[PDB]
Structure 1
Amino acid sequence: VGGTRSAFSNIQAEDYDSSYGPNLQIFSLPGGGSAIGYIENGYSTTYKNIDFGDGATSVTARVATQNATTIQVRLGSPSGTLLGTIYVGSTGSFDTYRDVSATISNTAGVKDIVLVFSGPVNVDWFVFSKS
């Protein structure tokens, strides 16, 4: 139990190890599971010890928002190397979740991953893959 999490299976956004976000909340979704939300510019969540194996070059996140925003994917810390940026257009509602993807620089081994938020968005989960 609680072995190293794979980059290639969904990582629940509420399963962060550390964060910056005084108003950030975890809440239940109608369809099952939970999301993070009540996010503001400059908030972040950190996911320790994610096993990328011998590499991933894409990320997909299941997200909801009413206004275009971005989610930076960074290595180690909120000011660490920028791996890529997910562009999150409106999903019409904070309750309507859709999958959005972005390229990242090749990331391998066991790494700490940080999501850095530029504005309001709700996140259910995210996952990596080889493009």
Structure 2
Amino acid sequence: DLKNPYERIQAEAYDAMSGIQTEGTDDDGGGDNIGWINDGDWVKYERVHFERDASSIEVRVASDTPGGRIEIRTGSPTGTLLGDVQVPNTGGWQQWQTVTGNVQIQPGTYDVYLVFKGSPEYDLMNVNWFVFRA
């Protein structure tokens, strides 16, 4: 039941969420993505174990709007910001690209939250999976 942050974590495999819905993805490899993402929404992945320090996160994203950002926090949706990732317009809801952002995460087991932020006026993005790099 521990998750491995150094291999892809599928975004739909969350343990709790606020604000979002899942759908089948047209990204290569098929599977699913989370979507209907708005400013202040989040997803929680429990028991993410880091054996060594993480220095960045890579996220597979799509957006038909101006996009937004993903904040990486632990413990709760308000927990200390460990890094963020900018998500641009990608040309459509199933036009997928990989983006990256720096993080600083020390070894330990965490409840990881991705908290989505941007304009309140439009849905922000879709996310297929994410993975950390050491």
> TM-score scaled to structure 2, two decimals?
0.89
Which stretch has the larger CA shift, 57-66 or 102-111? Answer: 102-111
Aligned residue identity for 1:25: Q
Q: After the TM superposition, which parts of structure 1 deviate over 4 Å for at least 4 consecutive aligned residues?
A: none
- Work out which of the residue numbers 25, 28, 33 in structure 2 matches 1:29: 25
Deviation (angstroms), 1:80: 0.3
Query: Within 5 A, what are the aligned runs for 1:1-131?
Result: 3-21=1-19, 24-30=20-26, 31=28, 32-66=30-64, 67-119=66-118, 120-130=124-134
Deviation (angstroms), 1:85: 0.8
Identity rate, percent: 37
Runs (5+) with no aligned partner, structure 1: none
- Summarize deviations over 1:61-114 as a string: whole Å, max 9, x none: 000013131010001111001001100111111111100000001332111110
Inter-partner Cα distance in structure 1 for 2:67 and 2:2: 33
Runs (5+) with no aligned partner, structure 2: 119-123
Contact persistence 2:53–2:104 (CA under 8 A): no
Contact persistence 1:57–1:107 (CA under 8 A): no
How many residue pairs are counted as aligned between the two chains?
Answer: 126
- Summarize deviations over 1:16-67 as a string: whole Å, max 9, x none: 101111xx21110134100000111110000000111122111000000131
> TM-score scaled to structure 1, two decimals?
0.91
CA RMSD of aligned residues (A): 1.1
SS at match of 2:113: strand
